[PDB]
């Protein structure tokens, strides 16, 4: 139980790539180790636990972790990252085999997965405001994961970071970002002037 560290607060991997999250502990007494995951809108849930029973410990959702005494580590691996793996992961140590006594948690690693966009044609579109408030929004969509969106300088204008959505029945993922304003001179054709692609439709 005495202490725990999670080196790397943020990890980003490609859909398909090795996931590795670090956990390292000190303990005056024999440690019992624990990996917890916290999916988006959900609570803490146990992935796996090390009792003094075996070294390589298989857990839920295709995670594994090897307990190494000689390196004071219990690293969490999975060979192939899925989009559904995006979450925060928390390592923990206790003095009880079961986890009955106080768990001391580490600082957490947010895991993000970068989607493999299959066949990209980027585009900027204007979306009809559903009422009479002629503040349209503009939608940058279908860009490759390479592309990054950048904030505005002129802040009567609001842009949001890139986002990923999966339409599971069509086996289709696509990135999007949204720009909008109340300014009547705000053209969609010229929001998003940052790290764009030459071949975007309009």
């Amino acid at each position: 139980m005495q202490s725990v560290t999670q080196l790397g607060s943020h990890v980003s991997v490609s859909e398909g790539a090795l996931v590795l999250l670090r956990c390292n502990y000190s303990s005056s007494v024999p440690p019992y180790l624990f990996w917890y995951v916290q999916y988006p809108n959900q609570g803490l849930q146990l992935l796996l636990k090390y009792t003094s029973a075996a070294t390589l410990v298989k857990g839920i959702n295709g995670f594994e972790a090897e307990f190494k005494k000689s390196e004071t580590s219990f690293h969490l691996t999975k060979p192939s990252a899925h989009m559904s793996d995006a979450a925060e992961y928390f390592c923990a140590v206790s003095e009880s085999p079961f986890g009955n006594e106080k768990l001391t948690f580490g600082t957490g690693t947010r895991l993000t997965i970068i989607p493999n966009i299959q066949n990209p044609d980027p585009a900027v579109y204007q979306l009809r405001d559903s009422k009479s408030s002629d503040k349209s929004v503009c939608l940058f969509t279908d860009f490759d994961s390479q592309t990054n969106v950048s904030q505005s300088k002129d802040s009567d204008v609001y842009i949001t970071d890139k986002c990923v959505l999966d339409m599971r029945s069509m086996d289709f993922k696509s990135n999007s970002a949204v720009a909008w304003s109340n300014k009547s001179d705000f053209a969609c054709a010229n929001a998003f002037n940052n790290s764009i692609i030459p071949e975007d439709t309009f």
Partner: protein, 241 residues
Amino acid sequence: VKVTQSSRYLVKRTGEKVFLECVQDMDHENMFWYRQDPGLGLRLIYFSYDVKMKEKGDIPEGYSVSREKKERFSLILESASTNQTSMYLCASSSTGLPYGYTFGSGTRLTVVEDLNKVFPPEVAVFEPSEAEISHTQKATLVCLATGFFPDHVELSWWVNGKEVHSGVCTDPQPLKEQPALNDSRYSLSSRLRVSATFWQNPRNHFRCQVQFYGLSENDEWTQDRAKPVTQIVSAEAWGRA
């Protein structure tokens, strides 16, 4: 086998004394209060190993606790500071059973210096571009929630009355409508994407739903507008032809 916390969200004015409340149904001996903060993981405030027992955790400073009944473990902030703003997490365990820790679902607490600053969101739905339909045979509706403080919202999409997970992006972080102010009001976007077939059929209903968590019945209110209470705000649109 559950641990419920009394409130799932809460707003409080700086200096107000706050009672977070944790309840379990499992006859558990051990109850724990943690906070969770971006970058510092989870940190143990107080814990209790029997009825009428407490022990200070790693960060007890500013908090107090009561284990009165075996079922209940009350966390008390004497005087809300804005660094008491956090997600609070309750947990319980049995001494002998080997099943580990059961966790509650969290209480987000935001402490501010004035309760007239809390606005519920307005929800506009923007409808797909003719041009995307044409180029892609997809239809992306966008929903904007603007005009909320504090950052306490739960955005959702409903297609003909069933909540859909398929084809949705919500922003993980909102942006500040006025990021010059300290406590500026917030905006958040979400997206829903379907086949043009689905969207070009006038018997398909699409609704953008936004729950906000502000104030309870208890709180002092007599200002201009309606009370900024927990409310679901929706926007709707029908599929086209």
